[PDB]
Amino acid sequence: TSNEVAQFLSKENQVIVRMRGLPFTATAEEVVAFFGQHCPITGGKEGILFVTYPDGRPTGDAFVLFACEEYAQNALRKHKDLLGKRYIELFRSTAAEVQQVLNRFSSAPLIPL
């Protein structure tokens, strides 16, 4: 959702973490649970951007917002922890990379506003 992407990238002073390898059935609630209260996501479920194909099919990828560097460190320590049956690879990212990744899956490129 263009409004969803825009809302996600509008949050200032965030650290972005990329999730790779998610169960295709992964939900925002499960991602919140994966990080737990020691890595609170900015906006809760609203700080989670699932990367999807144009028809909404999942990719296995997501981005999440952390407001504090301590949260990002805690989060990165969960690299290869399980969500469901699958180990989750975690990487730091940036707004520019979020844009490039989203562009990989959309018919038209993102235009930031």
Residue numbers in the entry: 312 to 424
How did the manuscript describe this experimental structure?
The full-length ESRP1 is predicted to contain an RNase H-like domain and three quasi-RNA-recognition motifs (qRRMs) similar to those in hnRNP F. ESRP1 has been shown to control alternative splicing of multiple genes during EMT, many of which contribute to alterations in the actin cytoskeleton and cell motility.
Crystals that diffracted to 1.65A with space group P3121 were obtained for the ESRP1 qRRM2 domain complexed to a 12-mer RNA with sequence UGGUGGUGGUGG. These helixes cover the beta-sheet region, making the qRRM domain different from canonical RRM domains, in which the RNA-binding region is located at the beta-sheet region, whereas the qRRM2 of ESRP1 binds to the RNA substrate through loop regions. The structure shows contacts with just three nucleotides of the RNA, with the sequence GGU binding within a double clamp arrangement. For G1 recognition, besides the stacking interactions from Arg397 and Phe335, the base of G1 is also specifically recognized through a number of hydrogen bonds.
